[PDB]
């Protein structure tokens, strides 16, 4: 019920990736959260990720817990490589 992605976008994760990621996760009622720096935050938060301070060449772990938790984590995987944001 989770996965790991390798941030490769040369810039980090700010509002550009936080807006496209919050929209995809919003499509699923499951609880999608983002784990980074040993801290738990919400994938639908633009300021929450900014507090983490994610940068290029980083590692994160997504998690889903609900009814369509499976379609949410795999739906974010194709959305990442589709826009060249992570892998």
Short mmCIF file of C-alpha atoms in Angstrom, two decimals:
data_model
loop_
_atom_site.label_atom_id
_atom_site.label_comp_id
_atom_site.label_asym_id
_atom_site.label_seq_id
_atom_site.Cartn_x
_atom_site.Cartn_y
_atom_site.Cartn_z
CA UNK A 1 0.00 0.00 0.00
CA UNK A 2 2.81 2.45 -0.88
CA UNK A 3 5.78 3.03 -3.21
CA UNK A 4 9.10 4.90 -3.56
CA UNK A 5 10.04 7.48 -6.23
CA UNK A 6 13.38 9.11 -7.11
CA UNK A 7 12.98 12.89 -7.57
CA UNK A 8 15.10 13.75 -10.64
CA UNK A 9 13.49 17.08 -11.72
CA UNK A 10 16.29 19.71 -11.65
CA UNK A 11 14.54 22.22 -9.34
CA UNK A 12 13.05 20.21 -6.45
CA UNK A 13 9.39 20.06 -5.36
CA UNK A 14 7.63 23.44 -4.95
CA UNK A 15 4.21 24.69 -6.30
CA UNK A 16 4.58 23.31 -9.87
CA UNK A 17 4.84 19.64 -8.76
CA UNK A 18 2.70 20.27 -5.64
CA UNK A 19 -0.22 21.47 -7.84
CA UNK A 20 -0.15 18.55 -10.32
CA UNK A 21 0.36 16.03 -7.48
CA UNK A 22 -2.42 17.47 -5.28
CA UNK A 23 -4.88 17.24 -8.20
CA UNK A 24 -4.19 13.55 -8.99
CA UNK A 25 -4.39 12.56 -5.30
CA UNK A 26 -7.63 14.57 -4.99
CA UNK A 27 -9.19 12.30 -7.66
CA UNK A 28 -8.92 9.37 -5.20
CA UNK A 29 -10.77 9.45 -1.84
CA UNK A 30 -7.95 7.31 -0.33
CA UNK A 31 -5.50 9.08 2.02
CA UNK A 32 -2.36 9.90 0.00
CA UNK A 33 0.54 11.21 2.13
CA UNK A 34 4.18 12.04 1.31
CA UNK A 35 7.09 10.93 3.53
CA UNK A 36 10.44 12.78 3.35
CA UNK A 37 13.27 13.56 5.81
CA UNK A 38 11.70 11.14 8.33
CA UNK A 39 8.67 13.46 8.46
CA UNK A 40 5.05 12.71 7.52
CA UNK A 41 3.09 15.33 5.53
CA UNK A 42 0.05 15.55 3.21
CA UNK A 43 0.40 15.16 -0.58
CA UNK A 44 -2.42 17.73 -1.01
CA UNK A 45 -0.43 20.44 0.82
CA UNK A 46 1.60 23.13 -0.99
CA UNK A 47 3.17 24.63 2.16
CA UNK A 48 3.55 21.23 3.88
CA UNK A 49 6.03 20.02 1.22
CA UNK A 50 7.84 23.40 1.30
CA UNK A 51 8.61 22.83 5.00
CA UNK A 52 10.29 19.51 4.09
CA UNK A 53 12.75 21.25 1.74
CA UNK A 54 12.85 18.59 -1.02
CA UNK A 55 15.45 19.16 -3.75
CA UNK A 56 16.61 17.43 -6.97
CA UNK A 57 18.20 13.98 -6.48
CA UNK A 58 16.04 13.09 -3.45
CA UNK A 59 14.03 10.02 -2.35
CA UNK A 60 10.40 10.04 -1.15
CA UNK A 61 7.83 7.38 -0.16
CA UNK A 62 4.10 7.70 -0.98
CA UNK A 63 1.36 5.80 0.91
CA UNK A 64 -2.38 5.28 0.29
CA UNK A 65 -5.04 4.02 2.74
CA UNK A 66 -8.70 3.93 1.63
CA UNK A 67 -10.91 2.25 -1.01
CA UNK A 68 -8.99 3.15 -4.19
CA UNK A 69 -5.60 3.35 -2.43
CA UNK A 70 -4.18 1.07 -5.17
CA UNK A 71 -5.42 3.18 -8.12
CA UNK A 72 -4.04 6.29 -6.33
CA UNK A 73 -0.39 5.21 -5.85
CA UNK A 74 -0.09 3.72 -9.38
CA UNK A 75 -1.98 6.71 -10.85
CA UNK A 76 0.70 9.04 -9.41
CA UNK A 77 3.50 6.90 -10.88
CA UNK A 78 2.32 7.37 -14.50
CA UNK A 79 1.58 11.07 -13.79
CA UNK A 80 5.20 11.58 -12.64
CA UNK A 81 7.12 10.06 -15.59
CA UNK A 82 4.41 11.47 -17.90
CA UNK A 83 5.47 15.04 -16.99
CA UNK A 84 9.13 14.20 -16.16
CA UNK A 85 8.91 15.07 -12.44
CA UNK A 86 10.14 11.86 -10.75
CA UNK A 87 10.97 8.19 -11.45
#
